Design an enzyme around this catalytic site. Structure first.
Site, short mmCIF file in Angstrom:
data_model
loop_
_atom_site.label_atom_id
_atom_site.label_comp_id
_atom_site.label_asym_id
_atom_site.label_seq_id
_atom_site.Cartn_x
_atom_site.Cartn_y
_atom_site.Cartn_z
N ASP A 23 5.89 -0.41 -4.45
CA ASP A 23 6.09 -1.73 -4.98
C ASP A 23 5.27 -1.83 -6.28
OD1 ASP A 23 7.19 -4.22 -4.81
OD2 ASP A 23 6.46 -4.59 -2.81
N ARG A 41 6.09 -20.84 -9.64
CA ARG A 41 5.30 -19.82 -10.31
C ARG A 41 5.26 -20.07 -11.81
NH1 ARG A 41 6.84 -14.18 -7.02
NH2 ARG A 41 6.52 -15.09 -4.92
N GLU A 61 15.20 -7.93 -8.48
CA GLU A 61 13.85 -7.78 -7.96
C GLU A 61 13.62 -6.36 -7.49
OE1 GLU A 61 11.62 -10.74 -5.82
OE2 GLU A 61 13.37 -12.06 -5.85
N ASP A 106 15.07 -5.74 -3.65
CA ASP A 106 16.53 -5.61 -3.65
C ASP A 106 16.96 -4.19 -3.96
OD1 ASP A 106 17.57 -8.27 -3.06
OD2 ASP A 106 16.59 -8.85 -4.93
N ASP A 114 3.37 -6.75 0.51
CA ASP A 114 4.28 -7.86 0.70
C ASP A 114 4.93 -7.71 2.08
OD1 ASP A 114 7.27 -9.15 -1.02
OD2 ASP A 114 5.93 -9.98 0.53
N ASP A 147 9.45 -20.35 2.73
CA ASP A 147 8.59 -19.36 2.08
C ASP A 147 7.87 -20.03 0.92
OD1 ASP A 147 9.21 -16.10 0.45
OD2 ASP A 147 7.37 -17.28 0.76
MN LIG Z 1 6.59 -14.38 1.00
MN LIG Z 2 8.87 -9.02 -4.52
#
Ligand SMILES: [Mn+2]
Ligand SMILES: [Mn+2]
EC number: 3.1.11.-
Length: 271
Positions: free
Chosen positions: A7, A67, A109, A112, A134, A182
């Site tokens: 990641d 964000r 992303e 994905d 994550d 979320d």
């Molecule tokens: Mn999350």
């Molecule tokens: Mn992510």
């Protein structure tokens, strides 16, 4: 031998956390070299994020919009920090291009892509190790695909789905995300139902869709009442969180042509 999918951005942030002043490109790759060495990797894959998701943004314009709010209120000094990091992230991603296959697709992303790669060549290995902190990646967990985080120095398999996620399997974790919400990725969930309260309804009535059929659900509680009047919400959330099912789509969103180049690009390394 195994397959490792990191990641890129998540790790970058980890380095940032530890210290947001010192360049980390060098160690960054070395960390991905020891790890790869450790997990008997055979194919190391580096994936970083770039821009907002095209797929999600459609089914939810305000996706991760919180964000942006945060950056808007940052001071002139913090904003500078943020730009410093990212610069170091780009450099950490450029150096990588010299040792490991590194991918980036503006509009798509990371989760994905990693889901696609796994879905694409996963069978070509004994195991698959995803490097992240994550827990949302845990939606890809299987008995032949797990994850390892530095922020805890813990590996994550399927049998651990209850301790680390308060559910029993991937489909469940999803539905819990599509139901509970979320806060991070800025996604609204049923007002009143969290992890413990949500899992119960999932253990009793089933998954989101199985639950959609069953609405209205019994019980006189408000979170239950709220639940019954939030169907539309569950549909949208389910498509935003169900990573292993909508990934291909999420990629084809930024172009049926891009998806193709990425597909061939993967097999090239897998072979
Ligand atoms: Mn999350
Ligand atoms: Mn992510």
């Amino acid at each position: 031998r195994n397959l490792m999918i990191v990641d890129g951005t998540n790790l970058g942030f980890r380095f940032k956390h530890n210290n947001s002043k010192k360049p980390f490109a060098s160690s960054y790759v070395s960390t991905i070299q020891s790890l790869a060495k450790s997990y008997s990797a055979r194919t190391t894959i580096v994936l970083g994020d770039k821009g907002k998701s095209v797929f999600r943004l459609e089914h939810l314009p305000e996706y991760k919009g919180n964000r942006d709010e945060k950056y808007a209120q940052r001071t002139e000094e913090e904003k500078a920090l943020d730009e410093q990091f990212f610069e170091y992230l780009k450099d950490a991603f450029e150096l990588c291009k010299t040792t490991f296959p590194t991918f980036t697709i503006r509009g798509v992303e990371a989760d994905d892509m990693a889901a696609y790669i796994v879905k694409l060549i996963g069978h070509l290995y004994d195991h698959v190790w995803l490097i992240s902190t994550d827990g949302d990646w845990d939606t890809l967990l299987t008995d032949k695909v797990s994850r390892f985080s530095f922020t805890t120095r813990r590996e994550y398999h399927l049998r651990d789905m209850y301790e680390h996620h308060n559910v029993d399997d991937v489909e469940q974790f999803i539905s819990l995300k599509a139901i509970m919400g979320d806060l991070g990725d800025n996604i609204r969930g049923v007002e009143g139902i969290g992890a413990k309260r949500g899992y119960n309804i999932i253990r009793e009535f089933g998954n989101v869709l199985d639950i959609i059929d069953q609405l209205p659900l019994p019980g006189k509680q408000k979170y239950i009442q709220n639940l019954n009047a939030s169907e539309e919400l569950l549909f949208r959330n389910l498509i935003l969180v169900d990573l292993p099912t909508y990934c291909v789509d999420a990629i084809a969103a930024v172009g049926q042509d891009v998806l193709d180049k990425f597909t061939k690009d993967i097999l090239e390394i897998a072979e």
